[PDB]
């Protein structure tokens, strides 16, 4: 009624202490202020708005926020991007992200969807007004989404054009299956309670075959491309980890196994997710590098051939971090009431 959908310059707000030199906390010292000890969330009358998580501006604001952080904190000895290369230095730090709250300025208010099972698109009854986002960790992943929020009710599957195979699929789970990756040459590994992994994959298929008119859903390994979208990629406390899922996508097992062990590797030269380019980073020291994250949703891409056959094949996707921000920012929308 009185408000208008619009885009603005949202201001951040961590909790990071300046006593910690871990780059997150150091980056969070400026640009962003403290958290709300009593943040307000006012239930909007009893009307219902209509959101869209594929055309939000918070996503591109937060995409740029995190880009500065990475090229200000994790600076590559040499960063080569279309057009030119920039020679720098490579220090050794640690990476445990801080939950960040996003906050609209003077006049503007954040509209939020608390509708039980929402797919970030259209009708949204239970709407509300807040000044900040919520505790979201800015973790850069691929294939699986880690250290994030989980669905309250049923499992949510959601994209822009479900039917289109170019539109990336976001799988938001209802249970957080733990994972554990460690580096004890560079080769490291991971391990997953496959007993909960393939049992909570079962319901990811069942819900996925409710939008494809009870068809057949089969999972498969990535068709190919760049190593960061083939191999589940992330940054464990400083080094870039590429872990081969596969054994986690080889359809089947849904008494087969218990513990899964994806191999994995650590790369020092890698294609940037900031721009079309690549940059060499720094080796590590024997730190027994270990990340124990919460897998909480996956990035899948469908194949071309729906009507043809009685089945659909899905594969691990990603590459566009923007979708990584989209999975948590799916409920809020910027509004200007000035």
């Amino acid at each position, epitope marked *: 009624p009185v408000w208008k959908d619009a885009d603005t310059t949202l201001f951040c707000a961590s909790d990071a202490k300046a006593h910690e030199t871990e780059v997150h906390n150091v980056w969070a010292t400026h640009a962003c202020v403290p958290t*709300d000890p009593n943040p307000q969330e006012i239930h909007l009358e009893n009307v219902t708005e209509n959101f869209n998580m594929w055309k939000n501006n918070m996503v591109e604001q937060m995409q740029e926020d995190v880009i500065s952080l990475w090229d200000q904190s994790l600076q590559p000895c040499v960063k080569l991007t279309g057009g030119s290369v920039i020679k720098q230095a490579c220090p050794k730090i640690s990476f445990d992200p801080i939950p960040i709250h996003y906050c609209t300025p003077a006049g503007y208010v954040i509209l939020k969807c608390n509708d039980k099972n929402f797919n970030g698109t259209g009708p949204c009854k239970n709407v509300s007004s807040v*000044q900040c986002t919520h505790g979201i960790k800015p973790v850069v992943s691929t294939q699986l989404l880690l250290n994030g929020s989980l669905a309250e009710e049923e499992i949510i599957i959601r994209s822009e054009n479900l039917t289109n195979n170019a539109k990336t699929i976001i799988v938001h789970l209802n249970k957080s299956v733990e994972i554990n990756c460690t580096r004890p040459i560079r080769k490291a590994y991971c391990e997953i309670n496959g007993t909960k992994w393939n049992k909570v994959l079962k319901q990811v298929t069942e819900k996925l075959k409710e939008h494809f008119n009870n068809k057949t859903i089969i999972f498969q390994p990535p068709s190919g491309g760049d190593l960061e979208i083939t191999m589940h990629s992330f940054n464990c406390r400083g080094e870039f980890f590429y872990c081969n899922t596969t054994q986690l996508f080889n359809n089947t097992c849904i008494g087969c196994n218990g513990t899964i062990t994806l191999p994995c590797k650590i790369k020092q030269i890698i294609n940037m997710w900031q721009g079309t380019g690549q940059a060499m980073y720094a080796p590590p020291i024997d730190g027994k590098i270990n990340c124990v994250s919460n897998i909480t949703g996956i990035l899948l891409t469908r194949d071309g051939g729906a009507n043809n056959t009685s089945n659909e094949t899905f594969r691990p996707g990603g590459g566009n971090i923007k979708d990584n921000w989209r999975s948590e920012l799916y409920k809020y929308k910027v509004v200007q009431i000035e």
Partner: antibody, heavy 123, light 108 residues
Framework: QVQLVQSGAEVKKPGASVKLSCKASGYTFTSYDINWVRQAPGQGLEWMGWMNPKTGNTGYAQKFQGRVTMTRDTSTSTAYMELSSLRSEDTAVYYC????????????????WGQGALVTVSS | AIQMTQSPSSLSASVGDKVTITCRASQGFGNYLAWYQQKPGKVPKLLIYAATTLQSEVPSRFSGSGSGTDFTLTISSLQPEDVATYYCQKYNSAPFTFGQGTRLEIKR
């Protein structure tokens, strides 16, 4: 018609504590927060703490971290703010305040100030 | 962080003069900058809110400028009714910190 009135002034001996009173009217005292701020004669403004009236969550400042203690009784629709271990540098005008009564957010400036209470700390 | 520093503590200013009271900070809080005025011996009342938006029933000689890290409160055509100290404050979220203060003169 939004009224936020205080009571009289107070004289207390060092280390005896004083409970300041605040009564608000003409709005939903349970909705909007209540802030407390003071001004020592020859002083500027110093914000003390905030309090959520429907669920008494309380936050204060580091400087006043520990002595301050805001409470409320919705039955009475009156806010409170004790200040124990009373030093005589803690003698100034203590006021309650609140914001623009709107069901919207971001409007958390103090638009309704109280009359003021003089807390004189001496024997 | 957040370090609000009101420029001057006291000023001269004829009558029907232009006075610019500056308010700076450490890190921006998204322009939710408030301007309060304390008339001597009175309780203070809100002037400008959200950086520039004037409050109802208040003279338009008061203008809230600046934004982000460097705000200003300007009064052109100063008069004897416009005297107290004007304190700048932040209200995005508690802690609702005020500035030191700024008291106005009259030159004479």
């Amino acid at each position: 018609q939004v009224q936020l009135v205080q009571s009289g002034a107070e004289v207390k001996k060092p280390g005896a504590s004083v409970k300041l009173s605040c009564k608000a009217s003409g709005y939903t005292f349970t909705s909007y927060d209540i802030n407390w701020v003071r001004q020592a004669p020859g002083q500027g403004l110093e914000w003390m703490g905030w309090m959520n009236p429907k669920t008494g969550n309380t936050g204060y400042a580091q400087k006043f971290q520990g002595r301050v203690t805001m409470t409320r009784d919705t039955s009475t629709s009156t806010a409170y703010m004790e200040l124990s271990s009373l030093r005589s540098e803690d003698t100034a005008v203590y006021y309650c305040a609140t914001y623009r009564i709107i069901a919207a957010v971001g409007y958390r400036y103090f638009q309704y100030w109280g009359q003021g209470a003089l807390v004189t700390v001496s024997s | 962080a957040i370090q609000m520093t009101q420029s001057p503590s006291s000023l001269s200013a004829s009558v029907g003069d232009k006075v610019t009271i500056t308010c700076r900070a450490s890190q921006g809080f998204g322009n939710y900058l408030a301007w309060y005025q304390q008339k001597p011996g009175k309780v203070p009342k809100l002037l400008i809110y959200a950086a520039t938006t004037l409050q109802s029933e208040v003279p338009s000689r008061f203008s809230g400028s600046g934004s982000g890290t460097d705000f200003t409160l300007t009064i052109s055509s100063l008069q004897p009714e416009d005297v107290a100290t004007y304190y700048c404050q932040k209200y995005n979220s508690a802690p609702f910190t005020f500035g030191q203060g700024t008291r106005l003169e009259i030159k004479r």
